[PDB]
């Protein structure tokens, strides 16, 4: 019943730099352990009995902490390091932090677009999807806005964004906007416009249905 | 040596049980206890309970007694556990995994098993080439999708050409509307490979037993 606190959820850290990763505790703490949680991935021991590097694990990473208080320091950030951290402690029963999120602060990056009409095969079925890709942009926030003939659409669109990337800490995000054949027999003009911090000027592909 | 390997992904419809396996090799079974994780997507890791196997003894996080039931079988190395009367807030991914003496650390861990808890039902994916728009494409290098349309529970699994083509890949983690899962994914690659050379997605969905290979076409 030691509850655990991270804090910040998500910590910003420029590469190459030394960042401290933190652990709050209700109570005083006798030894606290960390895991490295990848995208996709089971968690992983990083630190345990509060500064015991476990096997294998790089030496930039190091354990620190008393009473009710305790650090994972890395302290050279590289662009793996993208993963949740998760301290963990017993008193009774084991109790976990919520985690923090480490997002790597590289330079930021534009979003390269690419548009995709309809395939026959959906067409056939009576639907029709038009996705737009919008890729290896930095930081992740980035709004897509779609417009059918110039004006925008917003009901049935779908967007899913990548976790930050281990190599170049870029994210993607893909949208799908979903129309019936005949919604989208209806229009000619398509077009996916992304507005990225980097630029005010939206980054755009369009393509006509008749063409 | 030390591995922890689990049960597939499970459906299950609200109410119902679902039993989770933990397979344990490459050390005496009942020298440790098998610990168990809940994971939901936004709630950090949460410890479940325990079992010893051998002399069997259990110990449960009072938030989950009458919810987890552990067993363990030492003839098999298998470790279990029973949830019952499920619910959407059990839906997570669940792990077991294992330490040392007493108050330890989870130096080890299963890889996970996926747990959906919903009445909706199994549906097999529709799988769609994105072909670039007609005419020709920016600069030296070519953006082909796959989008993966109308299916339930995850997971899918996506690649391209088999495997063999890993990069410049981006798989779009999926999304729900209405019972129904939407995936895509991106490869981006030199104008010279394509389409002079054969670029297919491949699909799979298990639960349905899918799987569907896509040849992306130029239009």
């Known amino acids: 019943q030691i509850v655990l606190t991270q804090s910040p959820v998500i910590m910003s850290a420029s590469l190459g730099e030394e960042i401290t990763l933190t652990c709050s505790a209700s109570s005083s703490v006798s030894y606290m352990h960390w895991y490295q949680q990848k995208s996709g991935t089971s968690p992983k021991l990083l630190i345990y009995s509060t500064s015991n590097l476990a096997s294998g694990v790089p030496s930039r990473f190091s354990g620190s902490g008393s009473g009710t208080f305790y650090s994972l320091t890395i302290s050279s950030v590289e662009a793996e390091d993208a993963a949740d951290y998760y301290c963990?402690?017993?008193?009774?029963?084991?109790?976990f932090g919520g985690g923090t999120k480490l997002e790597i602060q590289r330079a930021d990056a534009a979003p390269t677009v690419s548009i995709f009409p309809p395939s026959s095969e959906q067409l056939t079925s009576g639907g029709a999807s038009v996705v737009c890709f919008l890729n290896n942009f930095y930081p992740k926030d980035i709004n897509v806005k779609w417009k059918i003939d110039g004006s925008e659409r917003q009901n049935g669109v779908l967007n899913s964004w990548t976790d930050q990337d281990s190599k170049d800490s870029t994210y993607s995000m893909s949208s799908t906007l979903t129309l019936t054949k005949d919604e989208y027999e209806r229009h000619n003009s398509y077009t996916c416009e992304a507005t990225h911090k980097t630029s005010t000027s939206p980054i755009v592909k369009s393509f006509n249905r008749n063409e | 040596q030390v591995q922890l390997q689990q049960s597939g992904t499970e459906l299950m419809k609200p109410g119902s049980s679902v039993k989770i396996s933990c397979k344990a090799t490459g050390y005496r079974f009942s020298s440790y206890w098998v610990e168990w994780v809940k994971q939901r997507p936004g709630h950090g890791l949460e410890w479940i309970g325990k079992?010893?196997?051998?002399?069997?003894?259990?110990s449960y996080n009072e938030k989950f007694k009458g919810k987890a039931t552990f067993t363990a079988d030492t003839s098999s190395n298998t470790a279990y556990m029973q949830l019952s009367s499920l619910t959407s807030e059990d839906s997570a991914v669940y792990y077991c995994?294992?330490?040392?003496?007493?108050?330890?650390?989870?130096?080890?861990w299963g890889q996970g098993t996926l747990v959906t808890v919903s009445s909706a039902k199994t549906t097999a994916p529709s799988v769609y080439p994105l072909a670039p728009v007609c005419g020709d494409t920016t600069g030296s290098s070519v953006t082909l999708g796959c989008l993966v349309k109308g299916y339930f529970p995850e997971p899918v699994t996506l690649t391209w050409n088999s495997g063999s083509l890993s990069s410049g890949v981006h798989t779009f983690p999926a999304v729900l509307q209405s019972d129904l899962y939407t995936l895509s994914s991106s490869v981006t690659v030199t104008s010279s490979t394509w389409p002079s050379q054969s670029i297919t997605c491949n699909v799979a969905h298990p639960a349905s037993s899918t799987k569907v290979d896509k040849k992306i076409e130029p239009r």
């Open positions: 995994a294992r330490g040392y003496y007493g108050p330890t650390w989870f130096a080890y």
């Open positions: 079992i010893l196997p051998g002399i069997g003894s259990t």
């Open positions: 963990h402690q017993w008193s009774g029963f084991y109790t």
